[PDB]
Amino acid sequence: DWEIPDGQITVGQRIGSGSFGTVYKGKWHGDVAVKMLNVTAPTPQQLQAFKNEVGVLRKTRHVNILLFMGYSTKPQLAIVTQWCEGSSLYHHLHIIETKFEMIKLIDIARQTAQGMDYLHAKSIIHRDLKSNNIFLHEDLTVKIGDFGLATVKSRWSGSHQFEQLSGSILWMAPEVIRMQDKNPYSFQSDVYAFGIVLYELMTGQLPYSNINNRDQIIFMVGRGYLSPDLSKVRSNCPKAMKRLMAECLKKKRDERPLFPQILASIELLARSL
């Protein structure tokens, strides 16, 4: 029973909403992050699968992984995770426009693959990897959050959680876009999302900067007609890095490398520099 009762979580300021919940800064033996899930009335079949997934997300302790502190069901079903200071990677690259060195950029890619390699080593599919879910704790260590939680995403019928498509489309793999597999989310779907995150670091832009139509991106990427313009990689980026990015962005998922190979690549060009 990883459940937190009522009156224990001092819910405070409203921060914002995402693909499957709304986050508040809470207090619980220190600052925490309380995400009020979008599934307000869970089914008792949905509720037991959610408790089962919390048990797996609970036993995960890694330096590049945001701590999962459990859940609560008293006012409404919610999630309590560690509160981290500073801004997310999305804020740094696209809002604050923080100017890192090339060494620091590669280091961010290393710790991200390092944390992702731990999640896949424990057979956990992130399903929502993006720069919004990557925080720079004290501007040093990378922390990945919002991982897993496949049951609180995609509402239930009564007992048939069909994986439904929600999240940000810029990081979704083509096989994820189509949802014509019914288990499209895989290790390589997270690897593809990691490839889009590499595109963020190496270009300073979001993919498809010349396309301002949401449904046009959904259709053309799912059809294989659209792909991130790799020309936008800045001049000072390593050639060994640009090739690794293109391997994660392969249209067919079986061609994408896994994180044991990706992390080994990054550390290789990390040394020789």
Binding site: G16, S19, Y90, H91, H94, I95, I96, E97, F162, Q164, L165, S166, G167, S168, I169, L170, I177, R178, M179, Q180, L206, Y208, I211, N212, N213, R214, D215, Q216, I217, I218, F219, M220, G222, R223, Y225
Partner: protein
């Protein structure tokens, strides 16, 4: 531009002058109106002038350079003054959210009216088609801008029988900022736009036709009605897009609606944007010539559908 419209247009500019700089402290929240995935809209009272306006709040996570440009680009809406375009009081930024202040339409969007109505009569959709065509014309001629997002939730109505468009692409930086949004559930996007740059106002006409079919039958027409569902008178987002591109366009049932209306929506849903009818042709279509001559009481029908007195 008749006399009752010139009266109401000039009356809006008068109350608009009573509003100066828009600050967040000058507003008192009355009630919530709706909440899409663009933002959330509140009914508010502007204390320095007592005016009741609708306040849309868009929370975008963009850099301040792009954001200040959005506020600058939105000031073109001060020039949009037509009885078929929702009035605009002023846009500003505060507390991490862009606030667009527009006139209050006490009837709500047609997407909300459709829910309370189930289906909408053809005689009413005739007047709605006239306003949308006139609204797209004013945007095309007097400002050379497209709408880019014609759908039932962007057609607004009020108790005075008015039907107006809103939420059209006036700010190019706001359009591109919205492109990094989560996936929706349904799309009104013309097949050309789904595949590469649009065909001007023709692509807005497709969306109007798709919106007419949905309001006429009370159901999103992609995919078309299944079995006996039509005589009773969960597709994925990507498959809806693949349907619009690689499948025949939807159509009205053959027995319930007049042939002038059925042909009107069929000319609007031609998958080729060049073979599709334009504003000049739709303005003189049979269904429009007829629906313009009919003396239908739109304002009374609206208040009856919501549950208010006329």
């Amino acid at each position: 531009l008749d006399e009752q419209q010139r009266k109401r247009l000039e009356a809006f500019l008068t109350q608009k002058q009573k509003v100066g700089e828009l600050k967040d402290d000058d507003f008192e929240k009355i009630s919530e109106l709706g909440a899409g995935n663009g933002g959330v809209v509140f009914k508010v009272s502007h204390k320095p002038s007592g005016l009741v306006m609708a306040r849309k709040l868009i929370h975008l996570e963009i850099k301040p350079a792009i954001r200040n440009q959005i506020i600058r680009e939105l000031q073109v809406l001060h020039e949009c003054n037509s009885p078929y375009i929702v009035g605009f009081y002023g846009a500003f930024y505060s507390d991490g959210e862009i606030s667009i202040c527009m006139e209050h339409m006490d009837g709500g969007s047609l997407d909300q009216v459709l829910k309370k109505a189930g289906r909408i009569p053809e005689q009413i959709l005739g007047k709605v088609s006239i306003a949308v065509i006139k609204g797209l014309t004013y945007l095309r001629e007097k400002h050379k801008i497209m709408h880019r997002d014609v759908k039932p939730s962007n057609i607004l109505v009020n108790s005075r029988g008015e039907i107006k468009l809103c939420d059209f692409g006036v700010s190019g930086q706001l359009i591109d900022a919205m492109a990094n949004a989560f996936v929706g559930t349904r799309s009104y996007m013309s097949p050309e736009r789904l595949q590469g740059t649009h065909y001007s106002v023709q692509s807005d006409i497709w969306s109007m036709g798709l919106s007419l079919v949905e309001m006429a039958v009370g159901r999103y027409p992609i995919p078309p009605p299944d079995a006996k569902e039509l005589e009773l008178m969960p597709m994925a987002i990507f498959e809806l897009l693949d349907y619009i591109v690689n499948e025949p366009p939807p159509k009205l049932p053959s027995g319930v609606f007049s042939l002038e209306f059925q042909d009107f929506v069929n000319k609007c849903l031609i998958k080729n944007p060049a073979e599709r009818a334009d504003l000049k042709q739709l303005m003189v279509h049979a269904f429009i010539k007829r629906s313009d001559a009919e003396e239908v009481d739109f304002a009374g029908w609206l208040c009856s559908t919501i549950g208010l007195n006329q």
